[PDB]
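During the reporting period the student researcher (J.K.) took over the structure-prediction task from the postdoctoral fellow and processed the backlog of single-chain submissions. One of the processed entries is reproduced below for the supervisory committee.
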Amino acid sequence: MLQYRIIVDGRVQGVGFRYFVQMEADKRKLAGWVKNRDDGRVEILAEGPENALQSFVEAVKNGSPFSKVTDISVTESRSLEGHHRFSIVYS
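J.K. obtained the following structure tokens:
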């Protein structure tokens, strides 16, 4: 099994884009956290199977909400965490 870290920029907020991505996390039973960086990006990190993690990357990258991405970066690992929920930093 796998993990990602993702960073995104664009209109990547508005009222709850960070909530939206964690809905899409739960929808594919990923488990991890979401944050808004002081540098202005949103950042996401979660464990899951490869197909779930990549389908989630498409869900962020597509900018399906009113909030949408215009730049994305992704890193991937095998470093499972034992995460069993989604979490939202109060950034």
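The committee noted the following: The chain has one domain: 1-91.
J.K. will present the remaining backlog at the next meeting.
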